[PDB]
Amino acid sequence: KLCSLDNGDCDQFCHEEQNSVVCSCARGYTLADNGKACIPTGPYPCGKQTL
Amino acid sequence: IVGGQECKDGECPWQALLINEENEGFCGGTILSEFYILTAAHCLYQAKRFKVRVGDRNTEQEEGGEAVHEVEVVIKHNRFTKETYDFDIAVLRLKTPITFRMNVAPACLPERDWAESTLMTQKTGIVSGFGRTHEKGRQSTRLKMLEVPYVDRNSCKLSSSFIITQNMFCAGYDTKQEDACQGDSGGPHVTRFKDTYFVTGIVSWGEGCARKGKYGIYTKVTAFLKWIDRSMKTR
Numbered sequence: 686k687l688c689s690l691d692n693g694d695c696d697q698f699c700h701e702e703q704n705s706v707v708c709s710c711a712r713g714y715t716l717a718d719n720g721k722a723c724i725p726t727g728p729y730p731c732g733k734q735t736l
Numbered sequence: 737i738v739g740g741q742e743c744k745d746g747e748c749p750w751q752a753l754l755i756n757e758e759n760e761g762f763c764g765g766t767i768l769s770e771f772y773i774l775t776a777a778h779c780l781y782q783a784k785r786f787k788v789r790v791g792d793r794n795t796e797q798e799e800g801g802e803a804v805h806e807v808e809v810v811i812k813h814n815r816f817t818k819e820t821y822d823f824d825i826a827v828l829r830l831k832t833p834i835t836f837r838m839n840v841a842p843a844c845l846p847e848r849d850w851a852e853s854t855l856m857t858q859k860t861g862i863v864s865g866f867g868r869t870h871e872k873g874r875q876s877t878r879l880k881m882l883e884v885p886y887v888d889r890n891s892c893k894l895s896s897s898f899i900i901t902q903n904m905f906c907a908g909y910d911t912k913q914e915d916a917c918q919g920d921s922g923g924p925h926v927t928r929f930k931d932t933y934f935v936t937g938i939v940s941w942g943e944g945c946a947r948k949g950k951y952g953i954y955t956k957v958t959a960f961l962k963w964i965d966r967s968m969k970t971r
């Protein structure tokens with residue numbers, strides 16, 4: 686729990702479920718298989734500076 | 737954008753620009769999706785008919801990547817009112833889809849409760865536009881960005897001359913000559929978190945530009961999320 690320790694170690698949206706964290710991502714990404722990180726689907730995803 | 741830095745190449749990819757029949761860029765916007773643009777409600781007044789330009793980082797030299805876009809339908813937030821500037825929000829759906837190239841990408845929408853607790857509680861935010869580089873100077877040629885500190889939900893109200901409502905939020909400085917300005921309206925106020933940007937607010941208003949004991953009044957974006965969606969679905 687404590688989606689306020691360090692964002693529940695999530696990459697984006699942090700969520701609590703009475704006892705622990707539950708990550709999710711902005712529309713356009715897909716949650717990593719480790720429940721925390723978010724990886725894009727297409728090549729130009731929201732939030733990222735086209736560098 | 738009085739002071740601030742120059743939006744370097746591919747640094748402000750969501751920066752949309754509302755232009756008029758005179759090809760002059762009067763207001764700004766933020767890209768939310770291949771079809772939708774987020775803008776300050778009042779903005780739909782400083783023009784008669786407007787086009788939405790994207791990809792431009794300079795108003796006088798073809799960068800090749802720009803592109804114009806016509807508006808198919810304009811979603812002004814009904815309950816808006818110049819007399820108070822409350823509910824200064826609106827949404828434009830493009831006639832044709834935007835094509836994400838470099839310098840052209842959409843910014844993310846955060847989750848309300850998440851945003852309010854992590855995005856806004858954050859130390860600072862990012863505001864950008866082609867607006868004035870001084871309260872009196874002429875509009876800007878290049879695309880500028882100025883990182884602005886968050887302002888106390890209270891000091892905000894005190895310094896003001898008018899009610900800072902629910903849908904409002906301060907951001908900027910109390911003495912530093914840095915702040916958005918004329919023409920910047922509609923612009924994107926973004927918060928950065930782990931190398932990703934979220935649309936936290938809209939460029940709403942202020943009293944003058946970069947004035948002392950005065951700040952920049954933005955539109956609390958998270959105070960309209962569900963509206964913005966209802967909009968992405970059109971309504």
Ligand SMILES: CCOC(=O)[C@H]1CN(S(=O)(=O)c2ccc3cc(Cl)ccc3c2)CC(=O)N1CC1CCN(c2ccncc2)CC1
Nearest residue numbers: 819820821898916917918919940941942943944952953954
């Ligand atoms: C002399 C007082 O100056 C003003 O307030 C001006 C600001 N500019 S502007 O083009 O450089 C301008 C526009 C938007 C801005 C947004 C941010 Cl975050 C920061 C600076 C900004 C500056 C445009 C304008 O129309 N005004 C006068 C207005 C704007 C604010 N007012 C309200 C009254 C009741 N309720 C809310 C607001 C009074 C008249």
Ligand SMILES: [Ca+2]
Nearest residue numbers: 794797798799
């Ligand atoms: Ca150009």
